[PDB]
Swiss-Prot record, chain B:
This is DNA-directed RNA polymerase subunit beta''. In plastids the minimal PEP RNA polymerase catalytic core is composed of four subunits: alpha, beta, beta', and beta''. When a (nuclear-encoded) sigma factor is associated with the core the holoenzyme is formed, which can initiate transcription. It comes from Spinacia oleracea. Belongs to the RNA polymerase beta' chain family. RpoC2 subfamily. The lineage of its organism: Eukaryota, Viridiplantae, Streptophyta, Embryophyta, Tracheophyta. DNA-dependent RNA polymerase catalyzes the transcription of DNA into RNA using the four ribonucleoside triphosphates as substrates. It comes from the Eukaryota.
Curated annotation (Swiss-Prot), chain C:
The chain holds residues 1072 to 1119 of 1361 of the full protein. Belongs to the RNA polymerase beta' chain family. RpoC2 subfamily. It is found in: Plastid, Chloroplast. In plastids the minimal PEP RNA polymerase catalytic core is composed of four subunits: alpha, beta, beta', and beta''. When a (nuclear-encoded) sigma factor is associated with the core the holoenzyme is formed, which can initiate transcription. Coiled coil: none annotated. DNA-dependent RNA polymerase catalyzes the transcription of DNA into RNA using the four ribonucleoside triphosphates as substrates. This is DNA-directed RNA polymerase subunit beta''. It comes from the Eukaryota.
């Protein structure tokens, strides 16, 4: 596919492959604390004290694209929607905020967000469900791939949800092959769906093919300890010396911000990797490069507005800011100082994104993000 | 949550409190450098690898 | 090493345990509240 | 203004109706007197 | 107890009760809601379901399941996200519907009217 006359526009395009959905929270586990089964007026008390996996919960890829374009970048989305009212309103919502929809395919065979299953009562009385007809979002075939977004886009971003369906596995791998043939990077976000939180070995087997093709990988703190060892990294966190502390900081019982050494993340490292990001919410971002590694320090505040705080969608803003600063500044790859300086913009965006109800309602602007970054960080850092 | 007892006592009894010293009260200062050699050692007469140290005179069974 | 506040507890070959403390400068004509080794709680006064 | 919602207390119960136990209708009161 | 009306119409049921409801004979469409307290967008879903349970007085049955209580059962039902609704037809010939995300109430009405 070679049709073009003039050079591409200034902000490099971003490729966002996945499923278009509204207010979706993939990463679900068992939270220790519950706040009443009926009264939803008190559920907001679980946003001040998150269950340590929903601290910065990522969402769909459309949320990431919207947050990226709202931060001053340019994004395009590949996906399929049905010929319904909901499908026609999702594309309207994405279009209203300058997200390119040249690669969104409308079809009438399937309905948006609706999938037909079948009850399959097994031995004992435990019911099951088998997908008879797939939902519209996860029904994209490799033939209807826009060979213009892939050529233009410089970063290919996708999440692990597409690894839970058969057809999108092949479609995603074909898109990855095309984008790599055209010279674009591959950004992997590991927002694991519920079924992938079953066992470490099964998930590692599932995501290995996608993991080995990624150039940049972003995972949460729990999504890394789960992938390496949950029991060991939970025993190490809750440990206090029997007699005497060690330095002095250990004598203050502060929170545990452990910077994993390069010999612990080695099983998850390969030659093609250019960056590994581990985000402990908006608190800290550990970055690992081929020749250096470090930690960027940040903060959070949801008690500043206890009645309009909603952590959903902050991880998408963090990832979108990371991508925006990666594409804007191409010298961050081999400069640790510039890397640390440009990684506080993402922290500011993630902090702002937790101050309002709704994932897409309150994604921050670039000017607001810069304002918060400069107001929180000392002039020497910013 | 462990701790070491610390009994004030001192052969005095007015209200008799007592303290618990944990790892959060006391810490360790990092490694440094200093001299630690002060000895008056003698000459060994190793027998069955149990030592028979004697300095001035010969072996004295 | 920039030692912290406290009283040296252990004098090992290359390390020291400090046990922490909190100095309070007191001027002449001041009123210490308590005998030696008086158990001081969280809020009670020390000197006027 | 949509009441219920996340930032409003539970609906205020009618005080007479809220007294489920320590309150009886006139018919039952008349019946129990004889 | 018939003296003061219940504030909330949706009744929370365990996994076994839901299995009995789906297996047993039914004459009205069934709605199964998956939710958790720590969930962000699930407050709005709870409010919309509460509103929907009033318009459909006796022509539908609406229940909810807490994934913090029944996690394996939710995983078995092919749930890959919290704001999930299951529509069950009153007849065994027609298959069930799974909807993901914060769907509008009008599309819910269309789902259990024109497709159930």
């Amino acid at each position: 596919d070679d049709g073009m006359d003039f050079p591409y526009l200034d902000p490099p395009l971003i490729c966002c492959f996945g499923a278009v959905q509204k207010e979706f929270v993939p990463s679900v586990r068992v939270s220790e604390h519950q706040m009443d089964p009926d009264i939803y007026s008190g559920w907001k008390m679980m946003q001040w004290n998150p269950p340590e996996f929903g601290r910065a919960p990522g969402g769909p890829v459309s949320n990431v694209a919207i947050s990226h374009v709202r931060l001053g970048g340019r994004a395009a989305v590949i996906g399929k929607v049905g010929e319904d009212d909901f499908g026609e309103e999702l594309v309207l919502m994405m279009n209203k905020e300058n997200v390119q929809t040249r690669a969104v395919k409308f079809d009438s065979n399937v309905k948006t967000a609706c999938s037909y299953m079948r009850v399959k009562f097994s031995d004992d009385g435990k019911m099951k469900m088998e997908t008879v007809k797939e939902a519209a979002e996860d029904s994209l075939v490799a033939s209807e791939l826009n060979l213009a977004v892939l050529k233009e886009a410089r970063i290919f971003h996708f999440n692990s949800e597409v690894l839970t369906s058969p057809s999108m596995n092949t479609t995603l791998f074909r898109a990855i092959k095309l984008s790599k043939k055209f010279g674009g990077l591959v950004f992997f976000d590991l927002n694991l769906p519920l079924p992938l939180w079953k066992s470490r070995d099964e998930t590692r087997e599932v995501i290995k093919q996608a993991w080995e093709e990624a150039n940049i990988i972003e995972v949460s703190r729990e999504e890394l300890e789960f992938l390496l060892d949950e029991d060991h990294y939970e025993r190490r966190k809750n440990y206090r010396p029997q007699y005497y502390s060690e330095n002095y900081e250990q004598s203050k019982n502060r929170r545990d911000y452990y910077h994993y050494t390069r010999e612990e993340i080695s099983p998850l490292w390969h030659d093609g990797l250019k960056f590994l990001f581990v985000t402990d919410g908006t608190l800290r971002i550990h970055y690992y490069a081929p020749s250096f590694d470090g930690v960027v320090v940040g903060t959070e505040d949801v008690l500043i507005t206890p009645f309009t705080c909603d952590r959903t969608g902050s991880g998408d803003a963090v990832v979108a800011g990371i991508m925006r600063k990666l594409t804007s500044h191409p010298e961050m790859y081999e400069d640790q100082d510039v890397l640390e300086r440009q990684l506080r913009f993402s922290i500011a965006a993630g902090i702002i994104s937790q101050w309002t109800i709704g994932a897409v309602r309150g994604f921050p602007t670039e000017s607001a993000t810069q304002n918060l970054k400069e107001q929180v960080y000392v002039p020497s850092m910013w | 949550n462990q701790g070491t007892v610390r009994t004030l006592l001192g052969i005095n009894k007015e209200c008799q409190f007592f303290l618990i010293l944990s790892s959060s009260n006391c810490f360790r200062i990092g490694p440094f450098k200093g001299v630690k050699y002060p000895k008056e050692l003698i000459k060994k007469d190793p027998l069955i690898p149990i030592r028979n140290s004697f300095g001035p005179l010969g072996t004295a069974l | 090493t920039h030692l912290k506040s406290g009283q040296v507890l252990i004098v090992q070959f290359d390390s020291v345990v400090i046990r922490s403390a909190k100095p309070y400068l007191a001027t002449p004509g001041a009123t210490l509240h308590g005998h030696y080794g008086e158990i001081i709680y969280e809020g009670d006064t020390l000197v006027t | 203004i949509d009441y219920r919602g996340p930032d409003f207390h539970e609906p205020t119960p009618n005080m007479l109706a809220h007294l489920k136990e320590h309150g009886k209708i006139i018919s039952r009161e008349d019946l129990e007197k004889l | 107890a018939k003296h003061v009306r219940e504030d909330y119409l949706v009744k929370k049921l365990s996994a076994n009760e839901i299995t009995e409801l789906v297996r047993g004979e039914r004459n009205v469409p069934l709605i199964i809601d998956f939710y958790a307290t720590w969930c962000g967008p699930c407050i709005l879903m709870a409010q919309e379901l509460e509103m929907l349970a009033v318009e459909y007085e006796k022509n539908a049955m609406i229940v909810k399941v807490d994934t913090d209580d029944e996690y394996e059962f939710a995983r078995d039902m092919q749930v890959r996200g919290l704001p999930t609704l299951y529509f069950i037809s009153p007849d065994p010939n027609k298959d069930a519907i799974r909807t993901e995300g914060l769907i509008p109430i009008q599309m819910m009405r269309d789902i259990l009217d024109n497709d159930m």
